[PDB]
């Protein structure tokens, strides 16, 4: 009787949630992956990336902003690095 299933939020079953330190650690792992992908492209001896578009177009580039712009990401922290790159550009 005390804790029988009572609905508070629409679609309560389909939503996830992370609280506490496990929230902060997940952001750090997502942020590090973006930095390690683009560590290579720094300095005169750096290398490039070859982007591929939605339809099939090929673009080879070394600019920092463009790589993060043509990239498609899902993690919310990753989009925060993309917006950081554009603001500097």
């Amino acid at each position: 009787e005390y804790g029988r299933p009572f609905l508070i939020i629409k679609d309560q079953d389909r939503k996830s949630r992370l609280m506490g330190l496990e929230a902060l650690k997940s952001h750090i792992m997502a942020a590090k992956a973006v930095a390690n992908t683009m560590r290579t492209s720094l300095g005169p001896n750096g290398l490039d990336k070859m982007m591929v578009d939605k339809d099939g177009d090929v673009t080879v580039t070394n600019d920092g902003a463009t790589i993060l712009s043509m990239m498609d990401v899902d993690h919310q922290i990753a989009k925060l690095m993309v917006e950081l790159s554009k603001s500097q550009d």
Binding site: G3, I8, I9, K79, L80, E83, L84, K86, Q88
Partner: protein, 521 residues
Amino acid sequence: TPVILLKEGTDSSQGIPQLVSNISACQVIAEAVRTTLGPRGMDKLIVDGRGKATISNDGATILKLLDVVHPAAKTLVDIAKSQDAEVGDGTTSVTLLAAEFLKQVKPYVEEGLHPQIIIRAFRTATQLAVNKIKEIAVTVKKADKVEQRKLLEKCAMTALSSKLISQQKAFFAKMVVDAVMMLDDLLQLKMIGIKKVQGGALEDSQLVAGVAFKKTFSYAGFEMQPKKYHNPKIALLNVELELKAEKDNAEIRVHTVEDYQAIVDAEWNILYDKLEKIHHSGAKVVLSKLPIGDVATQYFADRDMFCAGRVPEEDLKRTMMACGGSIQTSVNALSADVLGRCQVFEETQIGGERYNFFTGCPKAKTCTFILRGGAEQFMEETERSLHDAIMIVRRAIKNDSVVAGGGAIEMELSKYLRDYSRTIPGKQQLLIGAYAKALEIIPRQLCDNAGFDATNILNKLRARHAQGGTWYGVDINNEDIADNFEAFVWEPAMVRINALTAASEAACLIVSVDETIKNPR
């Protein structure tokens, strides 16, 4: 049985099991916003169906983005908008106080106490609690001009302590205060424009004592005309200056080519008449809500004068209020009074965009903010903290009475109610005593978030208040207690008073519910 009274699918519950379940339901709502309170509070990140993400610390904003459907919990959501629409600050304080009121009377409902006795208890202390706040509120009715400019700054900084821009609160408070003191005596919120341009550090934000807006779509020939003036005259318009057809209901029938050529030259003579009427008035900058054709721009280029079209309505009203002209729908009566005068006009580049600046007006009634962030959610969160500072100053102008924050006010009220319950007999002693216990949630939630020993600090605070130290709150940095009135932690008296009434009304309404019926679909 074969014919059922109400349609199939109707849900009906009642009794003590129904009422207790409502009390536990509100605890979940107060949980989502619990750890967003304090100088060391956090934010929350919410993502809707389409994938857009919102980062916010404002308590009222979080509850809106949740899809609450529980009927009892929706009461706590509405009181959040109540505190949002009246004072604008205190949306989380009124939520924690609401849940704590219900949780502290929950065991009595299990014992079978009649709710109408509970309701009478809440309404008794609130009139005592409100009347206590007004007595001990500090004010200086003597009109000193520099004290007022200091009191408003202290109130503004304290409203920014728990926000993302806490590290620059002293810089932003000066900007906010200056905005309000020159905003007329009705203080329309539309008289303040907030713009957002990407790129740049947070300290690059600025306030322009005038009007500034974005560059609009311009036709060929916009680039051979000067982009700076010293004493221009501004002619605001609501008339479409382009070659077109007079009336959509018009029609021309003609017999000879001689009139044909005369008609063709008639449209040009109309257009050149309006543009010659403007140029003779001595104005240099012309602004119109309606489109400006390329012919007008090329014509305005040949005489070293600036044109702009499709200007937004709101930006035009602010320009009129800052320059001091009037909108004209006709070009036949351009007197010297209907023009606007500014001290300098220029067009500059700001973070990849081009912006028009009207600065130097000595009789301005409008300001404009240029906010510099690094991402979309970085300036949107910045403006939400600014809005809390604007509204707080607006209320403080009408009533300059302040009390010390940081939990100092919640312990003076709780001590007062505890010293009044012992005088009255009966069950009215336990209910008021439980009420006075719910008022020390604010000092506990401040220490829990920071990371202190919340039990020890409360014991120290309770002894100081009962010793006879009215304004003693918590010291966040020093992990101790200290006087927050000499430590410059102030807030207007309206924030707390509106917090109690809304919280007391929500607790009384929920307890007074007997049964809930939900019908299908």
